[PDB]
Amino acid sequence: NGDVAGSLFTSTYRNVKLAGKAPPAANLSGTGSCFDTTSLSPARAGAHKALDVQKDELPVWSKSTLSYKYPAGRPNPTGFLKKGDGEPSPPQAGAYKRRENPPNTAFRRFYERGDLPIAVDHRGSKNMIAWKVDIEKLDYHHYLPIFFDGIRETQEPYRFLAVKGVEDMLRVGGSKILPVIPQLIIPIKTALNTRDHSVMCITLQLLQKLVLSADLVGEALVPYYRQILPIFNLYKNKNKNLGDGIDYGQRNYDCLGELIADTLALFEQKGGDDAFINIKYMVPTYESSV
Amino acid sequence: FYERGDLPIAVDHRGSKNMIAWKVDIEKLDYHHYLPIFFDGIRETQEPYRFLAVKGVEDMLR
Amino acid sequence: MREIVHIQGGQCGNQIGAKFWEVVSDEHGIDPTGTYHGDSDLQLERINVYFNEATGGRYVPRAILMDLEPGTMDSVRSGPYGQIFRPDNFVFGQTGAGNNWAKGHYTEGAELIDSVLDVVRKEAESCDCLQGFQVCHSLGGGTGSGMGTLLISKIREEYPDRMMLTFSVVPSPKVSDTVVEPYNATLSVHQLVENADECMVLDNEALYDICFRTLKLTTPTFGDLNHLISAVMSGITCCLRFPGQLNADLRKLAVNLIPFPRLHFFMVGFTPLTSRGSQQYRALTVPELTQQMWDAKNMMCAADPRHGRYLTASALFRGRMSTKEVDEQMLNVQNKNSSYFVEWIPNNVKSSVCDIPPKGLKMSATFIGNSTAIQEMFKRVSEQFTAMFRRKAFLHWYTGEGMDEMEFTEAESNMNDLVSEYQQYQDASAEEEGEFE
Amino acid sequence: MFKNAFQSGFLSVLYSIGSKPLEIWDKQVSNGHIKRITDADIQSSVLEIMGQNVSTTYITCPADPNKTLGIKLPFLVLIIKNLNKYFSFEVQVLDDKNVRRRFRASNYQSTTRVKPFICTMPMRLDSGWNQIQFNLSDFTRRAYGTNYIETLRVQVHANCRIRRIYFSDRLYSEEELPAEFKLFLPI
Amino acid sequence: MREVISIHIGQAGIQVGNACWELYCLEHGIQPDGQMPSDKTIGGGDDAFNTFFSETGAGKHVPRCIFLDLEPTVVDEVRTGTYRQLFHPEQLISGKEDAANNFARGHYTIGKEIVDLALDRIRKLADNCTGLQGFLVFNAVGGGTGSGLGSLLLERLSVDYGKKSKLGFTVYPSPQVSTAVVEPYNSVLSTHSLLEHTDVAVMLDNEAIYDICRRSLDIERPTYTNLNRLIAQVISSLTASLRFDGALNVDITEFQTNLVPYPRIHFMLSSYAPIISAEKAYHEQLSVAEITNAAFEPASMMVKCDPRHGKYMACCLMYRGDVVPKDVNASVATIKTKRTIQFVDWCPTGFKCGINYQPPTVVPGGDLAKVQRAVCMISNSTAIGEIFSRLDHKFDLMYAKRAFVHWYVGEGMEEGEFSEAREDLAALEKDFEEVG
Ligand SMILES: CC(=O)O[C@H]1C(=O)[C@@]2(C)[C@H]([C@H](OC(=O)c3ccccc3)[C@]3(O)C[C@H](OC(=O)[C@H](O)[C@@H](NC(=O)c4ccccc4)c4ccccc4)C(C)=C1C3(C)C)[C@]1(OC(C)=O)CO[C@@H]1C[C@@H]2O
Ligand SMILES: Nc1nc2c(ncn2[C@@H]2O[C@H](COP(=O)(O)OP(=O)(O)OP(=O)(O)O)[C@@H](O)[C@H]2O)c(=O)[nH]1
Ligand SMILES: Nc1nc2c(ncn2[C@@H]2O[C@H](COP(=O)(O)OP(=O)(O)O)[C@@H](O)[C@H]2O)c(=O)[nH]1
Ligand SMILES: [Mg+2]
């Protein structure tokens, strides 16, 4: 389908400059200049956060009214009576709350140490990749997971480099890609677990490119649906109801509600004769597209 | 039916008087569909409906 | 018809099955000799759901005790109601498990599975119409966790159409009796998710807290803990055993409760519960029962329903009572506390009534609730698991049984997928526009 | 409405290309979405409606009830893409006798069952883009043995991509159709 | 000569089976032994029991009913209750496994293996009849057995007889009170199936009967045993013209023609009057005029529909006891002058009245009182479509996320059968609106 390398910069500029929209607030702790290597934080991304609700704010259950009511107010000496007197929802869970995405990936660390054969190619008519060596002779087992682990990034030029890396390696991969699948599930799941729209819309297009990059990749991926579909089930019904308003935004890929539908159709297309039930098990709303 | 414009009739002012003008050939029409419709307009009194209806049956019976 | 076979795995399960079978034998009025000494034919009409008739007019449980370290098997044989078990239905290993899921599931499991499977088949033939299997575990130790999951995997492929219960005791959030407790819990929840049909979860802390506050006990023992467990395990099958104007088969009790195939971790409590003092004066009415069961205390596990929303709930009453009262009490609770119930379910409680009250009571009621607050237990368990596995402590043991670490990672990922399921369904409204904005 | 108008060769009720295509249509969405996107096969705009629960996401042709779409053209033709999902549409008809029949066609149905006021019937959609033509006057004669007078309401449910809805007054061929009233699928 | 076949399906089907057959055996003096006491014969006429019974070669009267179920735990109770000498054990049918609140199991998985059994019984049960008026199906729309099987049976009955009349006294899911959570599904799945196969379908609800029990009978402790007594009171009043004398007899055929205007509108309401206790019964005259007022009272309905939001397409009045035809004519005429009671313009008529000289019976130890007048009303109102809209909402509410669907599709069903059934409701709703 459409590429993911070019669209990203123009989108970010259109969003931040043209509209009054926010970046919004990408944490850049530990990262200084382009020269000093960052201090990788021990935290992990897409991590479920504990419940912060207080002790007492929890309402108590009244045995007499069958209702959760808030506790009464303890007296206070300042608030004493004077002469005149004539007179609970539960704490919501962060289902759609963007998890914290620290810059402590492995791609950033490897690129900082300078072990990658990539570089930006400004001599092209746009941002392109420039390889120090030949792609089709690389060790995919060592490099391909590293490149997937940089998809979660948001700081330039790391995310551009990472997306363009996987985009170019999947084209020339061929058979060298199939045995690497068991090592790609963790970074894919970690990128999806961030709840952030930018990384999610990127990884879904990369996942499409992944199933299309070679043959027999579909059946090989099928056993791993239980670890990548759980997020699909959330944003499957995040669409825009414009009515008569034509969607100019359709020029680029931003609507998850159908970026997920296309990807699920593609999974059922390539998975074989049993991918449909493994999909229907995770996302129940799905409908067979054959 | 005349309001919806499904009838092949029209008034023929080019004659020396009020005459009928058929868009098609009478002797090949479907009488089962048209002839009762034309009889049902005899009850009319508003022009030109009653003229058209009477002239319709008068020409179809010949 | 509607026969049921019972398993007790691990030390905890083999001990609590003792109390379960004592309570059932008392219900149906039989002596630890195996001889029936009741009064009515109501103790014999549907006795065949749990027992086998023997020569000489005696009744023997349809239970299978499986446990390494046969000290517990000799304990249950010494116990008062031990003489009723077929000694053939006793599968033990001479070695121990050392609280190690790896050897409980991989090495020492594969040596006893053949025997336990021959036993289960020999006695599953004896059933006319087998309803399902029920088992009792303890997710903390090795024997229970590993061998229960191994036998569940075997049973699921040998009898897929049948249905399976698991009355599992879960790790404790504040007490750490064993140190490898989170490993043993996660490596077993990963197996439960695909091969269980109903999974009740019970916790010693909430058991203690109930017994201390409500029952006013001064020194709770595992005896009283298992007394509570057996009360609930018995109240489950009242519709199969005794008549009821509104019966509730075990299968219609799962169909009406689990909406999605993965959300089968329930949460139970028992009513009435009171001390000897207020027993003399508390009137026993459907209102009292339904106002005690809906509390956030009677939940035998340590998950506060205040943090979530009830997907479904169920209340099985027993005793000659007015069903309009039950129906309207459930309706009025749903109406009052409407925010704690999901919206895409119009009415989300089931109410079942049996005519036969307990032996010493006039009315009782058992509660089940598939609340979305259960996700906090898995969150805590995964937190502990990943605080410890991050440093790779106590892993040489689990690797010694041929295991590797991708199994740990897979189990953790599946736990997180299940807590995400729970979170999504905790706030998906009936109308999609409010979720994504 | 559409009374005392002129319908002789064609009558287009809906067209994705325009300043506002849902002029007369009422739209009701519950768990779905309506928009206008550029299709890939037919490289132009198509108005798509989708969503779960087919029976709830639809669009009615007259803006409001108690207002009829008086149209007397026999043939009715839709241009729809087949998304391999549950798609259905309904058309209400006035017979020669003052009785409002209604026929509906569903792709998730397998048997036709004539009823006093309803006639459900299956539809065997093709793959991708296709135009479907209803006689709508043979249907009334074949079902209730009566004559067609004039359509009253049209309604199209979810999981489809509409491009054209038009009454034809006769079965025109691919040649006789004008440029706008045909399927020109480019390369 | 004038015989019917009474089929009871599911739990509530055979629960009221314990109520109807308690009443009929009590109506005709039959003791639970199936014999007559033969020394204190009370039946003023002979050969009236043949409507519901089959005299054997010598002395015994066996009911021509059929108790059907997949749960043994209730059918065995009948085999132990006092009413065990009555039924031929071939009639009591049971299964080893239950449908477990699942239409698919009651329809596709389990039912298809015992229908042959039940149908063979019905053959043997109809062959002894000489004139069969029609079947009388008791169902509980909302369960796996009642909906799954009841649907599966009626098809098998229609293909066999078709020309025979079939009635359905199906209890219906209440708006507020609900003893299940998945009853929206199997209810919808049931209606789409019974519709083309039932000829008439009376409808009543649990919750509405609770209030009739509250206001009138003033009972604080209602139970299914209290309600089932009322259903027996209706059908006794309904079938009286079959097995009793009286002016203006009404057969089943005569009853269905003038009450179903269009081939699908047949869901009808119900109401009984008077319904009182002993002490009130004897400080009162119970005039025919004040009874027929309580009948058309909205509170006395047995379903949670308000008929004052719609219009009456027809009304049938089965009077029972000491009633003279002049008073019916003078009291029905009173209500036509009333303003609250609307009638669609296309029926200047609207009343099919029936009188019986046989007063209603009371069960010793019951809750009703003995009276000399009683009115049971069956009306076909166009407002009934509102209760058909609640399900159109609840079904649509959960079918979005497709909850509990993995069960139905797991037991030999497809998602098509869901939206297939969904149309027939939305198609039915406007059918209730086209008549406006
Ligand atoms: C004289 C009398 O009846 O007194 C009661 C009594 O006062 C109370 C307090 C009982 C009593 O229970 C306790 O004191 C207790 C102590 C520790 C843990 C749990 C309970 C009782 O032991 C419990 C016992 O319950 C039964 O007998 C039930 O049939 C019960 N049976 C057993 O658990 C059982 C135990 C050992 C051997 C055989 C049976 C049962 C519950 C569920 C399912 C089947 C059976 C009864 C009513 C009483 C006493 C004796 C005081 C209570 O227990 C139950 C289960 O009813 C505790 O709160 C309830 C309310 C009872 O009213
Ligand atoms: N009026 C009345 N309603 C009853 C009675 N018993 C049950 N019901 C209602 O019937 C509904 C349940 O129907 P069931 O008959 O139990 O279900 P089923 O058709 O047998 O299918 P399974 O449950 O799988 O056996 C509930 O809503 C009950 O409230 C009764 O005795 N009288
Ligand atoms: N309710 C109850 N819980 C027990 C009992 N005995 C042990 N437990 C718990 O069971 C846990 C130990 O697990 P265990 O079964 O002994 O190890 P395993 O044999 O390898 O499965 C501990 O958390 C104990 O607290 C008992 O008698 N009653
Ligand atoms: Mg039932």
3-state SS string for C337-392: CHHHECCCCCCCEEEEEECCCCCCCCCEEEEEEEEHHHHHHHHHHHHHHHHHHCCC
Cis peptide upstream of residue E274 (ω within 30 degrees of 0) = yes
CB E409 within 8 A of CB A284: no
Residue environment code for C173-202, b if the CB has 16+ CB neighbours within 10 A, otherwise e: beeeeeebbbbbbbbbbbbbbebbbbbbbb
Q: Do B6 and D4 touch (CB under 8 A)?
A: no
Bridge partners, residue E354, by sequence: E318
Q: Do D117 and E430 touch (CB under 8 A)?
A: yes
Residue C3 annotated as lining a ligand binding site: no
Q: Give the number of the atom of ligand 2 that is nearest the alpha carbon of residue E144.
A: 21
What is the amino acid identity at position C301?
Answer: C
Instruction: Look up residue C309 and give its two tokens.
Output: 């929303």
- Find the catalytic residue in E254, E297, E414, E433: E254
The dihedral region occupied by E406, where left means phi > 0, alpha psi between -120 and 50, and beta the remainder, is alpha
Closest listed ligand to the CA of C241: 1
Of D74, D101, D100, D88, the residue nearest D166 (C-alpha): D74
Q: What is the number of other CB atoms lying within 10 angstroms of the CB of residue E214?
A: 13
In sequence order, which residues have a C-beta less than 8 Å from that of residue C16 and are 6 or more positions away? C8, C136, C167, C226, C229, C230
Distance CA E6, CA D16 (A): 59
Resolution, Å (one decimal): 3.6
**C360 C-alpha vs ligand 1 centroid, how far in Å?**
7
Residue environment code for C300-337, b if the CB has 16+ CB neighbours within 10 A, otherwise e: bbbbbbbbbbbbbbbbbbbbebbbbbbbbbbbebbeeb
Distance CA E179, CA C347 (A): 9
Distance CA C355, CA E17 (A): 19
- Residues recorded for chain C: 437
Q: Indicate contact of A with D: 3+ CB pairs under 8 A.
A: yes
Which E residues 386-425 touch A at CB under 8 Å? 400-402, 405-406, 415
Distance CA A182, CA A184 (A): 6
DSSP annotation of E140: B
The whole-angstrom distance between E399's CA and the closest CA on chain D is 7
At C7 the three-state DSSP class reads: strand
Bridge partners, residue D105, by sequence: D89, D121
What is the amino acid identity at position E132?
Answer: L
Which of C245, C345, C428 comes nearest E224 by C-beta? Answer: C245
Q: What SS3 string covers chain A? A: CCCCHHHHHHHHHHHHHHCCCCCCCCCCCCCCCCCCCCCCCCCCCCCCCCCCCCCCCCCEEECCCCEEECCCCCCCCCCCCCCCCCCCCCCCCCCCCCCCCCCCCHHHHHHHHCCCCEEEECCCCCCEEEECCCHHHCCHHHHHHHHHCCCCCCCCCHHHHHHHHHHHHHHHHHHHCHHHHHHCHHHHHHHHCCCCHHHHHHHHHHHHHHHHHCCCHHHHHHHHHHHCHHHHHHHCCCCCCCCCCECHHHHCCCCHHHHHHHHHHHHHHHHCCCHHHHHHHHCCCCCCCC
Of C280, C268, C278, the residue nearest C199 (C-alpha): C268
Helices (H), E340-386: none
Of C239, C209, C215, C225, the residue nearest C136 (C-alpha): C225
What is the amino acid identity at position C28?
Answer: H
DSSP annotation of E147: I
Determination method here? Answer: cryo-EM
Of E148, E95, E183, the residue nearest C256 (C-alpha): E183
Q: Whose CA is nearest to atom 17 of ligand 1?
A: C224
What is the amino acid identity at position E291?
Answer: I
At C431 the three-state DSSP class reads: coil
Distance CA E150, CA E398 (A): 24
Distance CA A286, CA A279 (A): 7
Does the Cβ of C246 fall within 6 Å of ligand 2?
A: yes
Of C251, B27, E308, E430, the residue nearest D65 (C-alpha): E430
Instruction: Look up residue E295 and give its two tokens.
Output: 């009948």
CB C303 within 8 A of CB A54: no
CB E237 within 8 A of CB E318: yes
Phi, psi at E329, each rounded to 5°: -60, -35
Chain D residues within an 8 Å CB radius of A243: 22, 27, 34-35
Q: Give the number of the atom of ligand 3 that is nearest the alpha carbon of residue C177.
A: 23
In sequence order, which residues have a C-beta less than 8 Å from that of residue E137 and are 6 or more positions away? E7, E9, E150, E153, E154, E166, E167, E168, E169, E170, E198
Q: Across the beta sheet with D148-157, what order do the strands follow?
A: D26-28, D58-60, D148-157, D88-95, D100-106, D118-122, D113-114
Helix B31-39 with B49-61: angle, nearest 10 deg: 130
- Residues recorded for chain B: 62
Instruction: Look up residue C244 and give its two tokens.
Output: 């009821």
Q: State the DSSP H helix or E strand holding residue B21, giving kind and residue range, or none if neither.
A: strand B19-22
CA geometry: angle E74, E80, E84, nearest 5 deg: 100
Match 């499991």 to its residue by tokens.
Answer: C109
Mutate to test the pocket of ligand 2, among E206, E211, E228 (most ligand atoms within 8 A of CB): E206
What is the amino acid identity at position A232?
Answer: F
Q: Whose CA is nearest to atom 14 of ligand 3?
A: C141
Q: Do D53 and E396 touch (CB under 8 A)?
A: yes
Residue environment code for E301-325, b if the CB has 16+ CB neighbours within 10 A, otherwise e: bbbbbebeebbbbbbbbbbbbebee
Of A98, A129, A276, the residue nearest A193 (C-alpha): A98
Chain D residues within an 8 Å CB radius of B4: 72, 150
List strand residue ranges (DSSP E) for chain D, in order.
11-15, 26-28, 32-38, 45-51, 58-60, 76-82, 88-95, 100-106, 113-114, 118-122, 128-134, 148-157, 160-167
Q: Give the number of the atom of ligand 3 that is nearest the alpha carbon of residue C16.
A: 28
**Distance between alpha carbon E31 and the CA centroid of its chain, in Å?**
25
CB E355 within 8 A of CB E319: yes
Distance CA C288, CA C298 (A): 13
Q: Whose CA is nearest to atom 2 of ligand 3?
A: C222
**C71 C-alpha vs ligand 3 centroid, how far in Å?**
14
Helices (H), C106-160: 109-124, 142, 148-158
DSSP annotation of B25: -
Match 């195939």 to its residue by tokens.
Answer: C261
Helices (H) and strands (E) in chain E, counts: 16, 12
What is the amino acid identity at position C87?
Answer: P
Chain D residues within an 8 Å CB radius of A268: none
Q: Do A48 and C416 touch (CB under 8 A)?
A: yes
Instruction: Look up residue E313 and give its two tokens.
Output: 């397409």
Q: State the DSSP H helix or E strand holding residue E19, giving kind and residue range, or none if neither.
A: helix E10-27
Chain D residues within an 8 Å CB radius of C429: none
Distance CA A170, CA A208 (A): 11
Ion ligand 4: protein residues whose beta carbon lies under 5 Å: E 11, 143, 145
Closest listed ligand to the CA of C235: 1
Q: Whose CA is nearest to atom 26 of ligand 2?
A: E179
Residues of chain A that touch chain C, judged by Cβ-Cβ distance less than 8 Å = 48, 50-51, 53, 58-59, 61, 63-68, 88-96, 186, 189, 193, 226-227, 230-231, 233-235, 237-239, 241, 281, 284
Bridge partners, residue E273, by sequence: E375
Q: What is the number of other CB atoms lying within 10 angstroms of the CB of residue A186?
A: 16
Q: Within 13 Å, how many C-alpha atoms sit on residue C303's CB side?
A: 29
Instruction: Look up residue E6 and give its two tokens.
Output: 């009474």
Q: What is the number of other CB atoms lying within 10 angstroms of the CB of residue C78?
A: 9
- C432 shares contact with chain D (CB less than 8 Å): yes
Distance CA D149, CA B1 (A): 10
Is residue E386 annotated as part of the catalytic site, yes or no? no
**C398 C-alpha vs ligand 3 centroid, how far in Å?**
20
Phi, psi at A128, each rounded to 5°: -130, 170
Q: Do A245 and D21 touch (CB under 8 A)?
A: no
Q: What is the number of other CB atoms lying within 10 angstroms of the CB of residue A230?
A: 24
CB A119 within 8 A of CB A133: no
DSSP annotation of E143: B
Q: What is the number of other CB atoms lying within 10 angstroms of the CB of residue B22?
A: 15
DSSP annotation of B28: G
Chain C residues within an 8 Å CB radius of A230: 417, 420-421
Q: State the DSSP H helix or E strand holding residue E191, giving kind and residue range, or none if neither.
A: helix E183-194
Q: Burial level of D182, CB count in 10 A (0-12/13-18/19+)?
A: middle
Q: What is the number of other CB atoms lying within 10 angstroms of the CB of residue E347?
A: 15
Q: Do D53 and E263 touch (CB under 8 A)?
A: no
**Partner chains of B (3+ C-beta pairs under 8 Å):** D
Chain B residues within an 8 Å CB radius of D72: 4, 6
CB C289 within 8 A of CB C235: no
Distance CA A30, CA A40 (A): 7
